[PDB]
Amino acid sequence: AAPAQQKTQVPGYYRMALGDFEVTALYDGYVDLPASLLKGIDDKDLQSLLARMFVASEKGVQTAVNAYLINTGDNLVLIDTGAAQCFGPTLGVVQTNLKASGYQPEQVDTVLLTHLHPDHACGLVNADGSPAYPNATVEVPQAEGELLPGVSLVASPGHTPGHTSYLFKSGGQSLLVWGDILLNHAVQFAKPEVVFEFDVDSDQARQSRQRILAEAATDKLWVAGAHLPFPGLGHVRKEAQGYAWVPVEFSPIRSDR
Amino acid sequence: AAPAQQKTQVPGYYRMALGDFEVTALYDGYVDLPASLLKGIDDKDLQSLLARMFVASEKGVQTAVNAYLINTGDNLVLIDTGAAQCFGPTLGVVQTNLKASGYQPEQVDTVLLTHLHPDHACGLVNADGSPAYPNATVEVPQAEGELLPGVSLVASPGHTPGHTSYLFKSGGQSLLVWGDILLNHAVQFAKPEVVFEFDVDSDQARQSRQRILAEAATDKLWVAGAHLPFPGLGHVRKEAQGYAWVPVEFSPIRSDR
Ligand SMILES: [Zn+2]
Ligand SMILES: [Zn+2]
Ligand SMILES: [Zn+2]
Ligand SMILES: [Zn+2]
């Protein structure tokens, strides 16, 4: 006698203030990744780490893919673009969420890619072959502020040779849109030594991860992570061993802050 | 040259499957609570606990107020109703989010109150004096399933004498909509001994909290918490000392699960 269930999820966007900038986190969808792709750890310990965060793995680890839209006043900047249809119908929702968040793709004047992997770059092209962001300058990493006012490059090579993170600064606040520094929040904060099979260079990716985590924890900066649980926004805390992820708490943007 | 900032936040609803039931978490807004209202802990340790979770306290702890709408197939059930205008304009958004989530208040056939505090009960009445949920049977705690199919009472006295939690079970899964078992996730999971000044009976509230946390951790049940960071959904994990909150990871409702 209840009405039919609605099913539908809330739209995959989330707003956060960062000084005078506005951050809109955008969800692309998810992909199931086998836990066996994580290496450098015993099966038992891996499963314990997953169970600790109540992450199911029997049918693979459901992994989020996020992109970030930052309105700096000077520019509307999109970092990564999701996967379009490259990895199937559970992904490709970034542009839809961009629209849901109150912007249009024609407004994006800059697209920054952390790296060229499908789940970051395929979203540049619509199903009919038309450019998803037709008015944007697209920045591809090489295998005021600096790049733009308030926006600078933070090299983070390893996952791919040209893998790059982007730093946004406004009003004393900093946000690092870090790309694929890590793929599994339940394992690689606690044990950054753990690597991903599809890191092009796993040793290097691991070195960059250790460094970036140390810096993020030390400087208490905000992090925006392509494969962290959506909205993928939060801080890194140093633990006795390894690190912990602290996600932002849902909040409207406050005028009195 | 960027467009104007949108400001607006994504609507405050979140969908989760629980067996054959559908859970819609609903955000009422927030209230700033002084950290001085938490007792049983030194100032220093309290501040350390807050800083650990990156919770600002200089202007009070911004605290979420959540309600929960569960479609059990048999009933559309709302647990708590937010504050309406009882605590000012930063609250009172539950009904708005209920509408945003695709339901209408006329559809709610049952309202369960965890307790009679303003931030749970004031939402029963619209600004013009009309009933917010005019077709609902309202269950006030006394100072199949059992109450309804799949729905049972879990007494949790202390915060108020009649304070009550509600258990929903479907398809082997359980969700406890627990009310005000705790008020600050950054302090009272790690240190359940810490009490709230406006618990009517702080010793009793603390006993109920210890018991409920132990049970939630042991039985691995889902928890829906009125003052946990929205959507307020997740699990409780037992630590060497005290407990930890593990929030659900954003996900659509999956057909293949
Ligand atoms: Zn990648
Ligand atoms: Zn990726
Ligand atoms: Zn209360
Ligand atoms: Zn309350």
Numbering used by the authors:
A (entry chain A), B (entry chain A): 25 to 167, 211 to 324
Sentences from the paper on this structure:
Here we provide the structural and enzymatic characterization of the recently identified enzyme isolated from Pseudomonas pseudoalcaligenes dubbed OPHC2. OPHC2 belongs to the metallo-β-lactamase superfamily and exhibits an unusual thermal resistance and some OP degrading abilities. OPHC2 belongs to the metallo-β-lactamase superfamily and shares significant homology with other representatives such as MPH (identity = 48%; similarity = 58.6%), and lower sequence identity with the lactonases AiiA (17–18%) and AiiB (14%). We here show that OPHC2 hydrolyzes a broad range of esters, from phosphotriesters to the lactone dihydrocoumarin.
OPHC2 enzyme, as observed for MPH, crystallizes as a homodimer, and biochemical evidences suggests that this dimer exists in solution. This homodimer exhibits (i) a very important surface interaction, (ii) a high number of intermolecular hydrogen bonds and salt bridges. The monomer of OPHC2 is roughly globular with overall dimensions of approximately 44 Å×50 Å×37 Å. As for MPH, its structure could be described as an αβ/βα sandwich topology, typical of the metallo-β-lactamase superfamily. The superposition of OPHC2 with MPH and AiiA yields RMSD values for α-carbon atoms of 0.74 Å (over 213 residues) and 2.41 Å (over 105 residues), respectively. The active site of OPHC2 consists of a cavity with two metal cations: one buried (α metal) and one more solvent exposed (β metal). The catalytic center is composed of two metals bridging an activated water molecule as observed in MPH and AiiA structures, but also other esterases such as SsoPox or SisLac. OPHC2’s active site comprises a highly hydrophobic substrate binding pocket which thus seems well adapted for the accommodation of the hydrophobic molecules that comprise OPs. Comparison of both active site highlights amino acids differences in the leaving group pocket (e.g. Met188OPHC2 instead of Phe196MPH), in the side pockets (e.g Phe265OPHC2 instead of Leu273OPHC2 and Leu61OPHC2 instead of Arg72MPH, and the presence of an additional Phe263OPHC2 in the binding pocket), as well as the floppy region 168–210. The higher thermal stability of OPHC2, as compared to its closest known homologue MPH, may stem from a high dimer interface area and an intramolecular disulfide bridge.
